[PDB]
Amino acid sequence: SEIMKYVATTCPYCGVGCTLNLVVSNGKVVGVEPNQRSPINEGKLCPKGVTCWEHIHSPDRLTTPLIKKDGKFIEASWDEALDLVAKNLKVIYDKHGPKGLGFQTSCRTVNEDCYIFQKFARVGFKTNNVDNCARICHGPSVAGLSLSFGSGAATNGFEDALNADLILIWGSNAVEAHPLAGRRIAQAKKKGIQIIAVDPRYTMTARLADTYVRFNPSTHIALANSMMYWIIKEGLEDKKFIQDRVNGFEDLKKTVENYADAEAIHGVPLDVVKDIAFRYAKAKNAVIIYCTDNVRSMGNLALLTGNVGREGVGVNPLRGQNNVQGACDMGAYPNVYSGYQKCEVAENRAKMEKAWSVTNLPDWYGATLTEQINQCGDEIKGMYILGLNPVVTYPSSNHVKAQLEKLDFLVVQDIFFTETCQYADVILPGACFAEKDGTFTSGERRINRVRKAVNPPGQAKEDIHIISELAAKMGFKGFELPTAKDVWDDMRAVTPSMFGATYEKLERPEGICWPCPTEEHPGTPILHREKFATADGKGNLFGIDYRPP
């Protein structure tokens, strides 16, 4: 057939979204090659990207559906397994309404599968009990940055920090995780850019920094409060910015004026505090790289120094999962439909109803991952898990196992036989990133294409196909979407932003950044261009008091 064919794809291992070539010989992925054309990484990959191809053709991959029949799983046909799932979901619905079911996907999955998964969870039985890894993962920082600015995403890109004078890494292992985001720090120091690292431990990304600052762990609020106190005290705040685009300054004033001497809390001497504070406030264009109160303090700093809406500046919280941003965008949260359209507002609730040809959408705040797992027997019973391994990921794994065994009809879709699989009643095999054909979304809001290299191992299918077949079994209208392009077009019709991100535009190696409202718009690589995304269009900066644990 084919000998050494190159297929361009996105790396599935973190939020940088590096591009790579998979080498496919006789329908087998046999290696990973650089793609020098990519703007994100210029053909450069970390160890994970270099060896992403190893797990694709493992013998352990699930090949056919499995059904727990009075013990060990026996081999089932697709029709059999799907009819079983449809029957059990139907009965649990008809007995316990929409509260009885529970959905959660992984951030490993492509945008089209996250969107169709949340569409399945809402168009059919109307439940907002949909969620994903981002809760239990490191950062609920999206909510905090949303409160500060309006969009919880990173304000600027990665190439953008090359334009600053004062990259300020803060508590980030940006070279251990996101190494090709830390490549920007390496390039910047080669260009001679002031770099200040502030992690509690001397990490390999703190080696690159001109100044390194220890502080006692769990004291970010105190340290940032001190820095803002000195900025205010010597008046290096940005008056036009604060008076024009920011609100809450008096509250910040009261809250911070109690942090003149905080050496007791954080270990940083007042001399070093003044040094970093004045370097940051004096830098004309300074970018913060972060990795709830902790992220709103960063928003406080950026708003206080007027470092937001411009090239070479901003706040860039690093995500960590390959498609966590994409899942949140597609609307795999309890409270947002898609593109962060809140379900609390009847306006877009009715817009969803009209677009999806369904009635009486829930509007109540769903149950997050831990909410579901804790109430996994009390009112929730019946659970579809799209790619999670909760027994290995959640803390108190034994409690997780107890709750899952308290559960009626778990369904698990995975590419491998995990530990959570033993507790499933049905196991639907899935496809990995080399067999899907969707899109990922980087941490810098960039939509990248994933391309099909090989076929799923045996009888395994990809998630859009599985969910469409299940919805056709259960009699749900609106899941006639045979391709990732059709799923994407349905999503685009639904969402106001991302309306310009057609696949003919995503076939560009550059990709598209998420606020792309029209088809001629080139994208929005820098957010909050001259107005924010809150009610008055003005960022709010809050006063946080440090709580000792």
Partner: protein, 411 residues
């Protein structure tokens, strides 16, 4: 026609001759070899996307080489290591491969180390005056040329300037001016001196073609009997036209080659003294190499690194988990590669941490060369440590005029 002839060559097929960068002779020769069954496949470069994307391609259908026609100056890749990894080193199948000077040198390095079969491989070598990274070319065009890069149709380095053809006209800027401003050819391409691959089987270029054929003929130099046979077969079956080259063309070809040698020497100088001398060079090297995150891209991309397991992976040399890795990691590559480095730049350009691997390695290589007199990538000469000789060892000890190896070795 016989191993040393210098010819003008263009394709009989008008479409092949249009799509060739010059006369289409590389694409006519490759097509002929494939369809007359000298070779079982053809490894060439095609555009996968915009002309800034160069994708290697194994082609077995003779109908697909018209897609390979044209030269991509943003193709900074290296072919021979892909043939070893995913084509079993050409141990069972004949191939015909289009290659630049660095790609011919890499072929010879891997054949020295027994990793490919040059009896099976046919190397059609192209002249190379330099390659540009695709993304750097984009930034060049956006900033210095003041053009939207997606507008460009074709783009080439001709007469030492960067001609781009966009909608509206064409432009040109001296590559030396660009290279001073911080753009241009890759660093190793600036230092390169393998301009006409005379170690390949055929050397094709646009240098020395003068007069009525200045854009519709390829200057061919027949560098081996295998290439002579390929050319004679193509000319007889009528896929390729041959006229003897013009002596004035040969002369100015020699002059341009010599000038490119001098420019390469100047860049070698300014770069190697830019690295420093004494303990300053050790702080440059050590502080740069402290960035390495052990992605091993430099090892997997180097043509000379053919080892099943690198010694950089052995726990008695490098501690497995310590990430701010030792200088031993790069000392083990200086020791193993620097004697034969072909200055391909792959190690430098695939490094996520932007470490000047190629600059360090070539700075060591140039004077390992002027010490032992071994030029990498030219022929089947075994590596310096794979062939030690009694008389030569006596000679270097006597030349030091000393009873040991301590001093009077360098000037």
């Amino acid at each position: 026609a016989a191993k040393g002839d210098m010819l003008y060559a263009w394709a009989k097929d008008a479409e092949i001759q249009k799509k060739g960068e010059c006369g289409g002779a590389v694409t006519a020769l490759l097509k002929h070899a494939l369809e007359t069954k000298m070779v079982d496949a053809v490894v060439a470069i095609k555009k996968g996307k915009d002309l800034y994307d160069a994708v290697p391609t194994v082609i077995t259908n003779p109908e697909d080489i018209i897609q390979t026609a044209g030269s991509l100056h943003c193709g900074t890749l290296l072919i021979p290591k892909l043939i070893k990894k995913y084509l079993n080193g050409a141990k069972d199948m004949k191939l015909a491969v289009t290659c630049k000077g660095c790609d011919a040198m890499a072929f010879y390095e891997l054949a020295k180390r027994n990793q490919i079969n040059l009896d099976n491989i046919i190397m059609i070598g192209v002249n190379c005056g330099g390659s540009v990274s695709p993304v750097t070319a984009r930034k060049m065009i956006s900033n210095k040329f003041g053009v939207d890069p997606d507008t460009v149709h074709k783009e080439e380095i001709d007469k030492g300037q960067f001609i781009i053809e966009y909608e509206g006209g064409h432009k040109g800027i001296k590559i030396d001016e660009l290279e001073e401003e911080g753009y241009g050819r890759r660093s190793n391409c600036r230092r390169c001196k393998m301009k006409i691959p005379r170690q390949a089987d055929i050397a094709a270029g646009n240098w020395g073609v003068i007069g009525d054929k200045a854009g519709k003929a390829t200057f061919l130099e027949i560098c081996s009997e295998k290439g002579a046979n390929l050319v004679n077969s193509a000319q007889s079956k009528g896929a390729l036209e041959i006229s003897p080259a013009d002596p004035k063309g040969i002369d100015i070809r020699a002059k341009v080659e010599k000038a490119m040698f001098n420019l390469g020497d100047e860049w070698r100088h300014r770069d190697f003294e830019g690295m420093g001398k004494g303990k300053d060079r050790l702080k440059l090297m050590m502080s740069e190499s402290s960035k390495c995150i052990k992605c091993y891209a430099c090892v997997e991309a180097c043509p000379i690194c053919y080892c099943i397991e690198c010694s950089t992976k052995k726990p008695w040399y490098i501690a497995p988990g310590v990430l701010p890795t030792s200088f031993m990691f790069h000392l083990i590559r200086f020791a193993h590669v620097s004697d034969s480095c072909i200055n391909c730049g792959q190690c430098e350009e695939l490094c996520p941490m932007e470490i000047p691997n190629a600059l360090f390695m070539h700075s060591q290589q140039v004077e390992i060369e002027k010490m032992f007199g071994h030029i990498p990538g030219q022929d089947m000469t075994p590596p310096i440590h794979a062939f030690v000789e009694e008389k030569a060892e006596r000679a270097r000890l006597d030349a030091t005029g000393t009873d040991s190896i301590y001093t009077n070795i360098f000037t």
